[PDB]
Amino acid sequence: HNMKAFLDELKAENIKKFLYNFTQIPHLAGTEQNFQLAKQIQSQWKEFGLDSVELAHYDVLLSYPNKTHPNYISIINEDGNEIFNTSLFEPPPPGYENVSDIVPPFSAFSPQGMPEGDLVYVNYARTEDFFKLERDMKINCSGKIVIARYGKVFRGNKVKNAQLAGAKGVILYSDPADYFAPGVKSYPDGWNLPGGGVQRGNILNLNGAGDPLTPGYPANEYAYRRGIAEAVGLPSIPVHPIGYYDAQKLLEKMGGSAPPDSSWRGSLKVPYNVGPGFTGNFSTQKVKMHIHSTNEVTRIYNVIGTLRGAVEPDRYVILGGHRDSWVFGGIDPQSGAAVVHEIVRSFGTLKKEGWRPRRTILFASWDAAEFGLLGSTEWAEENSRLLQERGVAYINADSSIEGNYTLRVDCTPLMYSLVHNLTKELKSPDEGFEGKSLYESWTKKSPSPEFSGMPRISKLGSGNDFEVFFQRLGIASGRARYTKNWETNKFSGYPLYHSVYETYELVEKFYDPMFKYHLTVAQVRGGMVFELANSIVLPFDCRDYAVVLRKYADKIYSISMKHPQEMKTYSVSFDSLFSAVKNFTEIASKFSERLQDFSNPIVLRMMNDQLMFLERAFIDPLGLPDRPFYRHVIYAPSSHNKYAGESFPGIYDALFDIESKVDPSKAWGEVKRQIYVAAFTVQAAAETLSEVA
């Protein structure tokens, strides 16, 4: 009973069977079908051998279209005649044209409204796109309906940016430039997005809060809820997503200013004029949105499985991923959930033979992730005291594949060495690398930008269920999946993301017919969980944090040094931060020496507690400015793109666009405050690794 036994028990054929099982009907959060799936998973995890398997339910704010009053967009003429209407649904895929309860495309949490106005095209609706419009082009979005292409940044940030520009509505669409790979056919004949395809998704700006009505506390049966007016993160203007056939009809008549440059042009045969409004002949026509979606407090269900530890049952290694989907969830999330299911089955086989892990393993099937990470966040709010004193690590398990090219890992620096070591022991599933390690193929295909002979491992961003564990609670977190070639594939994510076309057949036909990439991902995620839960000494290398901290300090200093005169005027010094990083490096090196130089279980556990609480030490209980649930001082989701991680986010945000601030003394004062907070936090974290007395 060792890791090899665990790994060998995992089967591609089982992952395939589970994926098929999980994807025959929609499992939208808050629906009966997703409750039934929760009950099925609960029953199977018990069967598989877990010690306890419970449902944890919460009543959270969700959002749904009105079944009898459909959402749509029109072009309306000067007489009020609606001369063009966007689609009411995606053409369902072959053999699913009679499937009931497919939610039509909508932007979850949009308010209701019927705004009419002139269109402005805002490219990706990024912060810099809006800078270009108002500052350079002198185009005013106030009272306009903005149309933005999906891609580059989280859609909630696009909506926030549009609101702040004064838009009265937002239309999101999928441009073939970003969602149609050259030389591949549209679904069902290939993996591209057809012109009738539409990306669903929520447009909240929760900043880690969880359920909009209950920030800080679980949405249990006696919860006090905020009124809707005080809810966290809701958009103030109506929003709706469309496909590129419909977008073409909205964009083709656009007049006003030409696009500023080629980076504003997608692939449709339209000029990509910014507007506002339509060309001469059509200048009296307008665009009208009709949004009738409703926000509803609705019950959601997490499945929580426990495999009790033999030696340290009060130490938790968590493997979690969500279960709710927009429609069939062929990739997102069921390609992940099928992998978790097989991992539970394998651990359970060992358990039935008399094995237990050293530490407790918790397995989670989260609900309502698509509506803002609600299930994971409410559960973590409920259990925060247990998690912060006992939480060793969190391994996420959403989509197992977004491509078939190579591995992708995003994690805390504390897991780098674990990931390198594990992948050296796993077989590469790649063509041309038969008999080679996954480390070799991954390193060849995705080289580290810093180091020769190492693979790229990214920072954690957000937009997935590790957010509460990592950025709020400070528990070492990681994720892994198979991905595309980022050098040659310039499209955004995978094309059929959050569409009706994301099916079992998509995966089986186009992504992973042999389920070998799924199996490799199960071995990576499961192997990480195995080592974290069973290694005598926790498999964290504090020295890897020291290396990245210096890289991040260099980076933030370099941003600041774009303003040398202001740094002179306001005496802005990074000396404290570099000092703290130098001290962290020294103390980490000495800790590492002791870790290998110590039969004493108290010194061991004392050392294991130092390892465990190291990630915890980067937490500031006061949070980041105006984002109280982003508490990690080294990493937060980018304020411009929830998906991306930002390093030293407090200093980064203080420096961002600083040359535009009206009061430079105040602005640079805040930069100096953030440097102090960061230097202090790095030093305090270092000191947790010093000898304890």
Ligand X SMILES: *[C@@H]1O[C@H](CO)[C@@H](O)[C@H](O)[C@H]1NC(C)=O
Ligand Y SMILES: *[C@@H]1O[C@H](CO)[C@@H](O[C@@H]2O[C@H](CO)[C@@H](O)[C@H](O)[C@H]2NC(C)=O)[C@H](O)[C@H]1NC(C)=O
Ligand Z SMILES: *[C@@H]1O[C@H](CO)[C@@H](O[C@@H]2O[C@H](CO)[C@@H](O[C@@H]3O[C@H](CO)[C@@H](O)[C@H](O[C@H]4O[C@H](CO)[C@@H](O)[C@H](O)[C@@H]4O)[C@@H]3O)[C@H](O)[C@H]2NC(C)=O)[C@H](O)[C@H]1NC(C)=O
Binding positions for Cl ion, rule: CB under 5 A = 396, 398, 479
Which does residue 576 bind out of ligand X, ligand Z, Zn ion, none, counting CB within 5 to 8 angstroms by kind? ligand Z
Which residue lies nearer to ligand 29D by CB, 115 or 493? 493
The CB-of-41 to a copy of itself minimum distance in angstroms stands at 20
Residue type, 13: E
Backbone breaks in the chain after residues (C–N over 2.5 Å): 598
Give CA–CA dist 103/70, Å, rounded. 11
Query: Coil, strand or helix: which one is 558?
Result: helix
Half-sphere exposure of 386 (CA within 13 A, CB side): 13
In sequence order, what E strands does 494-640 have?
A: 635-638
Q: Which of 555, 641, 652 is nearest to 129 (CA)?
A: 641
Pick the binder of Zn ion from 212, 243, 333, 357 (CB under 5 A). 333
Considering only the stretches 121-129, 193-201, 414-422, 519-527, report the one whose residues sit in contact with ligand Y under the rule CB under 6 A: 414-422
Residue type, 487: E
Under the binding rule (CB under 6 A), the answer on residue 404 touching ligand X is yes
Environment class of 488 (CB within 10 Å of its CB; exposed 0-12, middle 13-18, buried 19+): exposed
Under the binding rule (CB under 8 A), the answer on residue 408 touching a copy of itself is no
Under the binding rule (CB under 6 A), the answer on residue 40 touching ligand Y is yes
Which does residue 216 bind out of Cl ion, ligand X, a copy of itself, none, counting CB within 5 to 8 angstroms by kind? a copy of itself
Half-sphere exposure of 677 (CA within 13 A, CB side): 24
Which residue lies nearer to Zn ion by CB, 289 or 368? 368
Under the binding rule (CB under 6 A), the answer on residue 580 touching ligand Z is yes
Scan residues 210-249 and list those touching ligand Z (CB under 6 A).
221
Which residue lies nearer to Zn ion by CB, 90 or 398? 398
The CB-of-625 to a copy of itself minimum distance in angstroms stands at 12
Which does residue 530 bind out of ligand 29D, a copy of itself, ligand X, none, counting CB within 5 to 8 angstroms by kind? none
Q: Supply 148's token pair.
A: 């933005």
Give CA–CA dist 66/294, Å, rounded. 7
Scan residues 550-579 and list those touching a copy of itself (CB under 8 A).
575-576
Scan residues 397-436 and list those touching ligand 29D (CB under 6 A).
398-399, 408
Binding mask of the shown chain, residues 486 to 525, with x at each position contacting ligand 29D by CB under 6 A: xx-----x--------------------------------
The CB-of-12 to ligand 29D minimum distance in angstroms stands at 22
What single string gives the DSSP state of each residue in 536-551? SS-S--HHHHHHHHHH
Pick the binder of a copy of itself from 83, 311, 514, 561 (CB under 8 A). 311
Which does residue 644 bind out of ligand Z, ligand 29D, Cl ion, none, counting CB within 5 to 8 angstroms by kind? ligand 29D
In sequence order, what E strands does 65-123 have?
A: 72-76, 82-85, 107-108, 116-117, 119-121
Under the binding rule (CB under 5 A), the answer on residue 398 touching Zn ion is yes
Give CA–CA dist 485/403, Å, rounded. 8
Give CA–CA dist 277/132, Å, rounded. 18
Which residue lies nearer to ligand Y by CB, 42 or 428? 42
Dihedral sign (CA 326, 330, 332, 335): positive
Query: Coil, strand or helix: which one is 428?
Result: coil
The CB-of-472 to Ca ion minimum distance in angstroms stands at 11
In sequence order, what E strands does 43-179 have?
A: 52-64, 72-76, 82-85, 107-108, 116-117, 119-121, 145-149, 169-173
Considering only the stretches 63-71, 176-184, 481-489, 574-582, report the one whose residues sit in contact with ligand 29D under the rule CB under 6 A: 481-489
Residue type, 537: V
Which residue lies nearer to Cl ion by CB, 240 or 518? 518
Which does residue 404 bind out of ligand 29D, ligand Z, ligand X, none, counting CB within 5 to 8 angstroms by kind? ligand X
Pick the binder of ligand X from 2, 36, 43, 66 (CB under 6 A). 66
Helix H segments across 141-196? 155-164, 176-179
Which does residue 396 bind out of Zn ion, Ca ion, Cl ion, none, counting CB within 5 to 8 angstroms by kind? Cl ion
Across the strands, what pairs with 458? 410
Q: Which of 508, 517, 522, 496 is nearest to 406 (CA)?
A: 517
Residues 6 or more apart whose Cβ sits within 8 Å of residue 129: 122, 123, 161
Under the binding rule (CB under 5 A), the answer on residue 332 touching Zn ion is yes
The CB-of-400 to Cl ion minimum distance in angstroms stands at 8
Across the strands, what pairs with 324? none
Interface with ligand 29D (CB under 6 A), residue total 23
Pick the binder of a copy of itself from 138, 269, 385, 568 (CB under 8 A). 385
Which does residue 585 bind out of ligand Y, Cl ion, Ca ion, none, counting CB within 5 to 8 angstroms by kind? none
Interface with ligand Z (CB under 6 A), residue total 7
In sequence order, what E strands does 569-658 have?
A: 635-638, 641-647
Under the binding rule (CB under 8 A), the answer on residue 676 touching a copy of itself is yes
Residues 6 or more apart whose Cβ sits within 8 Å of residue 360: 306, 307, 308, 309, 312, 313, 314, 315, 316, 317, 533
Under the binding rule (CB under 6 A), the answer on residue 66 touching ligand Y is no
Under the binding rule (CB under 8 A), the answer on residue 659 touching a copy of itself is no
Scan residues 661-690 and list those touching ligand Z (CB under 6 A).
679, 683
Q: Which of 409, 499, 372, 468 is nearest to 91 (CA)?
A: 499
Pick the binder of Ca ion from 90, 129, 211, 430 (CB under 5 A). 211
Half-sphere exposure of 259 (CA within 13 A, CB side): 17
Under the binding rule (CB under 6 A), the answer on residue 68 touching ligand Y is no
Which does residue 294 bind out of ligand X, Cl ion, Ca ion, none, counting CB within 5 to 8 angstroms by kind? ligand X
Under the binding rule (CB under 5 A), the answer on residue 329 touching Zn ion is no
Scan residues 533-562 and list those touching ligand Y (CB under 6 A).
539, 541
Across the strands, what pairs with 34? none
Environment class of 556 (CB within 10 Å of its CB; exposed 0-12, middle 13-18, buried 19+): buried
Under the binding rule (CB under 6 A), the answer on residue 98 touching ligand Y is no
DSSP state of 261: S
Under the binding rule (CB under 6 A), the answer on residue 282 touching ligand Y is no
The CB-of-65 to Ca ion minimum distance in angstroms stands at 25
Under the binding rule (CB under 6 A), the answer on residue 576 touching ligand Z is yes
Which residue lies nearer to a copy of itself by CB, 404 or 610? 610
The CB-of-237 to ligand Z minimum distance in angstroms stands at 32
CA–CA distances in Å: residue 118 to residues 166, 295, 527:
13, 28, 54
Using CB under 6 A, list all residues that contact ligand 29D: 201-202, 332, 370, 372-373, 398-399, 408, 446, 456, 458, 461-464, 483, 486-487, 493, 642-644
Using CB under 6 A, list all residues that contact ligand X: 66, 68-69, 140, 142-143, 191, 294, 403-404, 484, 510-511
Using CB under 6 A, list all residues that contact ligand Z: 221, 576, 579-580, 583, 679, 683
Using CB under 6 A, list all residues that contact ligand Y: 21, 24, 40, 43-44, 74, 82-85, 417-418, 421, 539, 541, 596
